[PDB]
Design a protein around this nucleic acid. Structure first.
Lengths: 29, 70
RNA sequence: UCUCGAGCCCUAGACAGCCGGGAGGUGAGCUUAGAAGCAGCUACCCUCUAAGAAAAGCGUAACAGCUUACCGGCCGAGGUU
């Protein structure tokens, strides 16, 4: 449950809002 | 292209060589504006988008030679 | 080779392998005719960014070149101490 993977998903979601698995994760949110 | 940093500094700085040990031996100084100009001459050699960052790049070679700022 | 235990990592993809990326300021400053990761001394900072040392090991007269770090992909189950 690494913290950097969590900060990433949020970072990604912040760009979509305005690693493939992390992208999917974000897209799924 | 445009000449390197090490030199563009030793010009407006008014000195020829650096310091055997930087940050410990401040050889020269450079006003913020002076650094704003150099950053303008290297716009092509630097990757930064804004002038702000371009500075951080230049403002990174000085303090490492005893080139304080004001 | 068999058996028992502890720590840590892992399907938010672990360990290994293979492929791709490994970038700019800048070939840092000093010393030196020259030294550009890599003779020696000191410092070891910030841009772009998903990464990429002021360079861990070879290599060169010095470059070049080949790779480690680091990032991404393929793969898919335990792996490592």
């Amino acid at each position: 449950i690494p913290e950097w993977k969590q900060e990433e998903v949020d970072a990604i979601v912040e760009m979509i809002e305005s690693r493939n698995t992390l992208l999917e994760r974000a897209l799924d949110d | 292209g445009v000449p390197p940093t090490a030199e563009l500094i030793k010009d407006e700085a008014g000195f020829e060589t650096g310091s055997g040990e930087p940050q410990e031996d401040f050889v020269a100084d450079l006003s913020v504006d002076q650094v704003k100009q150099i950053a303008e001459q290297k716009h092509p050699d630097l990757l930064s988008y804004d002038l702000t960052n371009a500075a951080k790049e230049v403002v990174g070679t000085c303090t490492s030679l005893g080139v304080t700022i004001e």
